[PDB]
Amino acid sequence: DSEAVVAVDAVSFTLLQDQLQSVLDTLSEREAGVVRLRFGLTDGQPRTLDEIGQVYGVTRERIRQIESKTMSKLRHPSRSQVLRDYL
Amino acid sequence: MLELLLLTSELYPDPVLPALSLLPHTVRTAPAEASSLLEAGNADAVLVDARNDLSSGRGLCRLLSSTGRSIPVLAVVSEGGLVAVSADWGLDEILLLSTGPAEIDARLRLVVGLGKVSLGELVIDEGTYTARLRGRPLDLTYKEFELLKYLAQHAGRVFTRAQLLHEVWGYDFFGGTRTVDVHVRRLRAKLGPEHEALIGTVRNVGYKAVRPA
Amino acid sequence: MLELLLLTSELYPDPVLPALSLLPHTVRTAPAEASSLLEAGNADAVLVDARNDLSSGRGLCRLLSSTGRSIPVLAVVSEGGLVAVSADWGLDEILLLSTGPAEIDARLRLVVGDQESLGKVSLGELVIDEGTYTARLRGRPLDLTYKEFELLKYLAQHAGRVFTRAQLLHEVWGYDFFGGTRTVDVHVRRLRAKLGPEHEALIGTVRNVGYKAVRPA
Amino acid sequence: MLELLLLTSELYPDPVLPALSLLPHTVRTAPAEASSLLEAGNADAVLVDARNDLSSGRGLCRLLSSTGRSIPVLAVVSEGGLVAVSADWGLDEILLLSTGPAEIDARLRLVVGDQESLGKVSLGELVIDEGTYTARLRGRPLDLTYKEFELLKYLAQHAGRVFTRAQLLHEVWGYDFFGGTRTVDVHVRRLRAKLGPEHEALIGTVRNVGYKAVRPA
Description:
This is part of a larger assembly, with one copy of chain A and three copies of chain B. Chain A is 69% helix and 0% strand. Chain A is built from five helices and no strands. In chain A, α3 crosses α4. Chains in contact: A-B, B-C, B-D, C-D. Chain B binds chain C through residues 79-80, 82-83, 85-88, 91, 93-94, 96, 98, 100, 102-103, 105-106, 109-110, 113, 156-158, 202-205, 208, and chain C through 79-80, 82-83, 85-88, 91, 93-94, 96, 100, 102-103, 105-107, 109-110, 113-116, 131-133, 146.
């Protein structure tokens, strides 16, 4: 049955999703929420930066600035070392 | 005359290289990382251990490479591992464990005994932080000089702000700042109407430094 | 691999470099004289013997390192005369007599210049250098919009794969504007134009699936 | 490192003494007359081409080895002219034209090593005598603090060179007190308290990044 759950992925998928909270929360909460809807993970719709302006009251370019603020400081291996085991 | 650095976890120069005892060139040892750049001071030579671990030595020479201006960087392998030895490591020589005393000494004297080039109609001075273009006076402050130099140094290599923050900035990165825009506009205006087409914008991805002509 | 002119008044290269016969390098041999400077031509690298004559070996390595000689120069010396040889002879590399054959191949590759081309994508006559961001055809610059190039490179980098419009929307039009498939056809219509019919064979279309690229013969 | 003057009937340091070109030393050229004795200056050795002129070469040695010429004086000669080289030459050392690179290196460290200063640099008014660990700026000495004197020279010897305080951290603090580099700004004050407007501009500020050293004109 091709539709079989490997059941290592599922447990590991929960672990992915939980390391996600543990990493986002260790990051700023504004940014954590920004990405939670930008990729629309907790929801069904990833968002563009001008939808975020209403929910977060700031110019879309400022979320352009925050996206890199997330990624680069994430790009410090400290976040990467604990997440690179997830592949 | 020289100090030699071995980026090795063998903790000893003679198991790594037997001839290094017969030469009075003194060797300090550090573990196999790139971070051991902080370990080296006035040492004119640094070697990467690649005898037992080949791709680790290739990566450490990649990290230890020609950036500035540059220090003699060496790496030592066995004989069957000589195929992976290429120019893409970042080297001036190759050493083996079968290399002798006079051989090691002469290759070291070859690397220590070349000059940076920066022409685009655009005088670039890596140490001087000085810029000229279509005239002696081209005032380049620190942020736009390395910036422009990176572009001119990578003429045509389409660059995006994300790519500049880790190179032109440190950086945090304090990215998505648009400060490249005002920085490039200054570079556009300061460089004058002529040579203003070298730094051209390619949309949605950033800019590239058009070569002359 | 390398056409190599050896500078020796001895007739054979095997007293000079004994391992050199062990490789497929074609070793032309010429006397240890200045007139061999005219016989350089298309020699890949020049082999100057200074195992014995270090003074005239210095002269010959200076001669092959003059103002307009880009052919890389090797001083082939003894072990007690390596310390007489340095970068003054116009050199980048030297070879001992007990240099091994894999060592000969490695140091000859290193003295010539490995040197793999960057993100230089190639699909038939259409060769893309994403670096400069040109999908030049047969050397002439080609002019696509920002999306067409990334559309094209994706297919160029995935030629043969049968993609779908819905599929292609994601990796070309990102996560946005999620409707309106026909943006592909309107763009494809331009792609197939600015490619030219001479190489629309690259661009393949299957009904009910979409578009693809095909490697030409 | 060391400066040499080459008194010669030739035009370049290559035919007269070739292993100086095998060295990273700096060798200038001059004719073999007495007026070239006015071209030595702050050098460390002066080497007469006496490979052909032995009588006039020894005369140039006698004018070079006179009362107050503190630069150690040298000649280069052939092997059939060494028999003329004796105590009546007045030379310090002798060097064959066939001498090696490291051989001339060790002979130069035996003949040199007029007490030319090592770390005595002078940036206009800023006369940084590191042999005495004192810097004269407009004559009057700089009574900076112990670590203030270091910072000033690291900015001085890097004239025109802009760096972030972290890079300055490695050259002033090194591996200590990484965070809170503000005191460098206060240490700039401790520099300007002892510099004054005559050269208070010589330390250029770089807002948001750091500072820089200005070359006086």
